[PDB]
Design a protein around this ligand. Sequence first.
Ligand SMILES: CCCCCCCCCCCCCCCCI
Length: 132
Amino acid sequence: SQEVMKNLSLNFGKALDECKKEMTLTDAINEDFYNFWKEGYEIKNRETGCAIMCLSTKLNMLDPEGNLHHGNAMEFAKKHGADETMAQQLIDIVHGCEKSTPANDDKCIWTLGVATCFKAEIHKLNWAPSMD
Ligand SMILES: CCCCCCCCCCCCCCCCI
């Protein structure tokens, strides 16, 4: 559901401010988040990946390192309105994307790659929202 992807995006972004008084980042990132679900948009700023990883770690979906906590990621989805089957589809995609993106000590760059892959698969389902 697009409606459910919108609420998940909004709620994922609530932790963002805060991250900011904790990593201190820029208007390039706000532009990337604003554009995230636009078709064909490409994220080019490394520090957007840092933001996503900060966000996810604050929500307990990433560990110290960047392996997804599947259980906590399911719980986030369900918290913000995914039913069991949508949540399980989402986790599978993120897990597929971790497997497919190359190892990188640079976790900010690793995150961008996973997050690109994720966005792509969400478009393929027609679940990318108009953040409107
Ligand atoms: C399973 C829940 C996803 C919820 C919100 C999506 C918004 C954008 C962040 C998702 C991309 C994840 C990228 C790196 C893996 C850490 I979950």
